């Protein structure tokens, strides 16, 4: 048990992590642009139904209600798929740093069970 050995080991294990976080986060932001543009593609089509309801109500049917609903539902699920990908990306970044943190914390615990590790 050696603090300089655990430090050397932890440094190498997290060396490419800052590069990985950029690669992951910028892949999230690239999908948030894709998500936002797909939001307009249904927030507009959602505005068509609501304007018709704001004036006439729900009992009257919009001229193309069946047509827009299929286009809204299609555009919404595409946004769902795009959001899930952002979660997966964000979770791996969390998973990576959390796992290294847990390994380091186990080493710090073992260094403290011997006399080798100084207090904070």
């Amino acid at each position: 048990m050696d603090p300089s050995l655990v430090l050397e080991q932890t440094i190498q294990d997290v060396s490419n992590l800052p590069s990985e976080f950029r690669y992951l986060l910028e892949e999230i932001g690239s999908n948030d642009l894709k998500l936002i543009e797909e939001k307009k593609k249904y927030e507009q089509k959602e505005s068509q139904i609501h304007k018709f309801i704001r004036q006439q109500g729900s009992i009257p049917k919009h001229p193309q209600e069946d047509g827009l609903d299929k286009e809204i539902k299609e555009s919404l699920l595409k946004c769902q798929s795009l959001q899930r990908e952002k979660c997966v990306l964000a979770n791996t970044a969390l998973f990576l740093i959390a796992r290294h943190l847990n390994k380091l914390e186990k080493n710090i615990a073992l260094l403290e069970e011997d006399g080798v590790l100084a207090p904070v």
Binding site: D2, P3, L5, V6, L7, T10, I11, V14, N16, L17, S19, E20, F21, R22, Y23, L24, E26, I28, E46, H50, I53, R54, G57, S58, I59, K61, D69, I72, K73, L76, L77, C79, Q80, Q83, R84, K86, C87, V88, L89, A90, N91, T92, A93, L94, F95, L96, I97, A98, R99, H100, L101, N102, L104, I108, L111, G115, V116, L117, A118, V120
Partner: protein, 297 residues
């Protein structure tokens, strides 16, 4: 020249030559089942790949069913059972059996016949990165289903957890796994690489690979390494601030997923109410069928 016969021998080339002469591998035939084994898609990203996970991180379960494991699953455990045992689930049990025996009976080969019984092992099977995956799922406040990363195939989601697989199938599978360990005399069931034991040096055996002869010795002092412990503590802090932000981002996308899962549900509810409203001729009732405008920075 041509047609001078003084033993002109022809050679066909199952072993090629290229132009000293140079031997050349012949063209490689293709494999028929390739399309059955290699199924999926890898999307190229705009920027160059950054990656540092190991093969172990990307393989899932340690155990892999062989042909004999396959016949035993179909023709014994799943022959006419009301409850069927998934291949992925069969490996989850065996993967836990191997890990348990490796920890409790590391010197099994000394006395293979005395391998632990299933009842003797069941306590240790219970205590058996599942914990970290669940801890993260709570910290994200997802609290739904499984924690999904890039290292997870979607087919592992339909697999039962280990603690219940012990009760349903544990005794039947372990008795079969136990016999395999007995046949191999407590050694490893499947082919392993041949490694040199630490502190020993082997030179004759051709199958010994990847020797590691370096050795680190402790410093001749009992003093505390103040310097390398401050910097270890400093790095531990920066990894904690690291995890705090990564957690927030994973929280942010999780609520962003709940929000859209709501929108997709609110939509499917508004259209069902409208189709229901027109069948009953009920008027008014449009407050919750249209989006209103509130404050958002």
């Amino acid at each position: 020249r041509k047609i001078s016969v003084k033993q002109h021998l022809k050679i066909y080339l199952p072993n090629d030559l290229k132009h000293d002469y140079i031997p050349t591998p012949d063209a490689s035939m293709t494999w028929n089942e390739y399309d059955k084994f290699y199924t999926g898609s890898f999307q190229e990203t705009t920027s160059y790949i950054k990656f540092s996970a190991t093969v172990e991180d990307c393989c899932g379960t340690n155990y892999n069913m062989d042909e004999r494991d396959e016949t035993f699953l179909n023709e014994q455990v799943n022959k006419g059972s009301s409850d069927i045992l998934t291949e992925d689930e069969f490996e989850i049990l065996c993967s836990s059996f191997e890990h348990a025996i490796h920890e409790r009976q590391p010197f099994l080969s000394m006395d293979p016949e005395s391998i632990l019984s299933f009842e003797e092992l069941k306590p240790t099977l219970i205590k058996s990165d599942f914990n970290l995956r669940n801890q993260l799922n709570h910290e994200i406040n997802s609290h739904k289903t499984h924690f999904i990363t890039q290292f997870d195939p979607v087919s592992q989601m339909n697999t039962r957890p280990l603690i219940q697989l012990i009760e349903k199938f544990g005794s039947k599978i372990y008795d079969y796994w136990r016999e395999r360990k007995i046949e191999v005399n407590g050694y490893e069931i499947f082919p392993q690489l041949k490694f040199e034991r630490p502190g020993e040096k082997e030179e004759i055996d051709p199958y010994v690979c990847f020797r590691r002869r370096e050795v680190r010795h402790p410093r001749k002092t009992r003093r505390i390494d103040i310097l390398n412990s401050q910097r270890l503590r400093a790095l531990h802090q920066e990894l904690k601030n690291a995890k705090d932000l990564a957690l927030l981002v994973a929280k942010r996308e999780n609520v962003s997923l709940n929000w859209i899962n709501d929108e997709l549900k609110i939509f499917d509810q508004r259209v069902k109410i409208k189709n229901l409203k027109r069948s009953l001729n009920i008027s008014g009732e449009d407050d919750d069928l249209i989006n209103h405008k509130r404050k958002r920075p």
